[PDB]
Design a protein around this ligand. Structure first.
Ligand SMILES: [Fe+3]
Ligand SMILES: [Fe+3]
Ligand SMILES: [Fe+3]
Ligand SMILES: [Fe+3]
Lengths: 301, 304, 298, 297
């Protein structure tokens, strides 16, 4: 199947170079625009599915409008955030560093499927983003731990644990609780993926004392360095990641300097466990944030 | 089912009173001797299967010879210990307190099925023994954790990690205890061959979990042990001379409490031969190091 | 902190015997009927026995009803309300039903943690239902240097937000207590933790669970515990500044009812004399703040 | 003292660019050789002390001999390893990836003070090295945790296929303080890592929990510098102030780097107490260095 993949890349006039065994690839030979032909878009789609995070360089032509137009080719853009309104209405303007391991917006039923990210303002040092493959983490589980997580369910919430305070106030202006399976089946690749991250509050049918120990054990397996791709930002860079197969972490190692990146996120579907059972909403309505995408299986998977 | 149990107790002339919801019962109406009739032995076997730990009182007639003779009615006695030779030849003479949660001799393939214990010397206060039901702990697991343990395997070893016994004498004992090395891979969930009940097999002889790294071992071991030793699952007995305890070593852990200062405490134990554990799929434990055939036979169990 | 010849003289003079039931905790007291008209010297002998042994049990106290238990408890301190928030389960005594199966020190979510409780059974199941206590003084004594250095500097937020639970949490209490308190009457250092603890000051949530579990395991180590099988006529008294306890729910669906009187305490102080701090709530209706008297034996 | 630092770098003709807040800097303007003048050597020493890990690039002139000769300017080179003899006699020839967080050779009394590392063979992707600042980790502890580690001691051992047999051919056990005071900077640094077997006066059950807690504070991403290797790169790190980890994310490809380590001294705790040897003799591996305080600290 590998040769078929390279042929698809070739025909689309792109090159895709692996940057890590389990995650990360650099794409060259293409300028991201809203008028990319369908075949090239699908080549990017395939590269993303396989490699989980893609980086593009020298995209100096991109502005907010151009980034938005390109992102629309891969899916239906969500509102910037379900609760945060003060940092953009079309794109999400992330300031500082998102330094906690997470999958984006897992506290709603319709977890977004992907994000497109480009830097706007960068510090003189530090400030990398790192991603972890939750697909590799599942693959690496021994049988008894697989038996555990296949049956495990978790409640996700936006009420997670001067300006930083104000932001949290807006972030939690309305309360969301969603019960998701800890193992979801990727609707386009069929791969099993761990669904956890910092929005997780509890595990169904388990006491609080056991939550912390098991959460820690599973997160450490996800964020194991061998499963991670860490990217040093330069102006002109663009990252695309599969939010159904990763967690990420923005590193706050740049002191008091300003750091700004602009994000477009694409609507996803409701997670299903290994038996095909869907997540359940306890609190909140995310219909104003995005629709529910109808996913399509990739025929190579 | 309970009518049948009541008739068996009645025919044997005993009463069996529950002392806790999940574990422990006191038996009255019988003097433990080597010549007990078969109906009474059957009744004790059934009471033990149901209640996991039995205590008998005012058995002042019992000495070492009598305890051994009674114990042989319940099964075939093992040697006092697989490696310890200096602390009894017919019975194991336990001194101080065995203050760590354990199932007896889980580091061999043939885990002994049961123990008979009587006090010889007791402190003026403290020194209770407490037992936990590993059957109840399994029953109380939520679905995902049960799925975990059903597939989990663990290596048990005799190289494991006060009570009026000197530090020096404890050293000599540990040296003898570990004079030869045993390693056995047991399932964390075993199926009781006589009751069919599932029970957790863990305890302080466990060194590692199969296919899991060391860091994850400590966290999961602690989690499962805390579920086993949860107070609701435990029966704690204050010893008096004349008492006798019998426990199902396939369905319990126990712990002798060192809360009596520098006072002396001595109890004498007889263990009965058991069989090799099987997991919920019928797969047997695997020996890595050691041979326990000098210590005990392998019992052929009978479903009750 | 020991039973010396002076202690024995005090017991003798008061006509009681005090039998140790465990190395670190628990004693049975004989020779006395708990009543509201006990002479001052016999009351002070009980106070001393309690300080030393942390939990006392008395037996064959069949003369006692709620009124009598309250009248006796009054000799040891100022009875609090049954509870800061729970009003529907007693007006003078707290009527505990079922089992309080979580390790705790009573009412640690207020500033004025009650100093002691007097407990007697009213209804008992045919098996099970023991109460067990742990010595938080012994737990501190047994810490090695690095862990003692940790806890001496550690502070924790306690809260009542752990039909009954609705009433229990009808008003919200949060109090920051030191993890190590200095007992105001004995001078002994004691761990102050238990299930009302929500967080540690200056520590993130992940580290909270690990450290809390670690410290609780040292407190509830079997060697530090006294477990009592109740009989009708028994009475227990415990030092709520020096213990935690746990009611065991191992009696199936049977009824279990014990009646409690709690006595007013003071605000904890750390090893530097700094007092706990109130974040939310006012407990002035529950009790006043007791002015303790240090025992001249400690 | 930032004016003094900027002046020392300038006077020695180097630039030192921070690559992370707590750790990592790139040094330019200098070719690493055995004949560097003393003032340029001291500028690198200061840069290393401050930034904990230095990287130099395009050092294509360097071979094993040149790397050795340069390293000699910073200290006394040790044997390649206390027990491993078949993988280099002057330099240590590291193959594969050292994927466990560790401080180098902490199981001896004389923990080496620094290492100089250069790649020889690199995989087509992956294979980065990441370092963590154990100084930053100490700085970030709240009071109660600081009170804990200041009094905590740990036993380190080398008993952590043919290679493992040689690595463990002789047994070393050393009891080190978990907090050491850096003899040249005065900074307090956590001393832990994968060679730690146990904590003094603490039971095994508490060991795993506290070890995991402290290591997580050390390897927290904000405290780490992760470097993608290219031929011609050279890294120098302060082994008294860091841990490191070679990432095994390059499949079955070949990866080889050559190391020179420099002799260190015996750790001291915050009360001036030195580590204690339980088993082993490292006198063949290196001598004990007499350190010098930097007058900038
Ligand atoms: Fe994010
Ligand atoms: Fe035993
Ligand atoms: Fe209580
Ligand atoms: Fe290394």
């Amino acid at each position: 199947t590998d040769d078929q993949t390279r042929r698809i890349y070739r025909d689309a006039g792109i090159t895709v170079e692996k940057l890590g065994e389990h995650i990360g690839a650099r794409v060259n030979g293409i300028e991201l625009r809203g008028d990319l032909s369908a075949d090239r878009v699908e080549a990017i789609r395939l590269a993303l599915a396989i490699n989980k995070v893609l980086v593009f360089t020298e995209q100096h032509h991109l502005d907010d409008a151009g980034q938005y137009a390109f992102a629309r080719l891969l899916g239906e853009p969500t509102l910037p955030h379900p609760t945060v309104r003060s940092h953009g209405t079309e794109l999400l303007n992330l300031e500082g560093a998102a330094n906690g391991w997470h999958t984006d917006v897992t506290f709603v039923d319709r977890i977004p499927k992907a994000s497109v990210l480009r830097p706007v303002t960068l510090p003189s040092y530090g400030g990398a983003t790192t991603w972890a493959s939750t697909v590799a983490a599942y693959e690496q589980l021994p049988k008894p731990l697989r038996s555990l997580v296949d049956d495990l369910w978790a409640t996700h919430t936006n009420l997670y644990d001067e300006r930083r305070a104000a932001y949290y106030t807006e972030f939690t202006s309305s309360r969301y609780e969603t019960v998701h399976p800890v193992v979801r089946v990727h609707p386009e690749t069929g791969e099993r993926s761990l669904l956890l991250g910092q929005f997780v509050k509890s595990f169904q049918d388990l006491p609080s004392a056991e939550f912390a120990s098991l959460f820690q054990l599973l997160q450490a397996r996800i964020t194991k360095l061998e499963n991670t791709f860490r990217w040093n930002w330069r102006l002109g860079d663009v990252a695309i990641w599969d939010n159904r197969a990763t967690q990420h972490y923005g590193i706050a190692d740049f002191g008091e300097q300003q750091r700004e990146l602009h994000r477009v996120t694409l609507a996803g579907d409701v997670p299903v466990d290994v038996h095909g059972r869907r997540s359940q909403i306890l609190l909140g309505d995310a219909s104003h944030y995005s629709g529910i995408e109808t996913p399509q299986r990739l025929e190579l998977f």
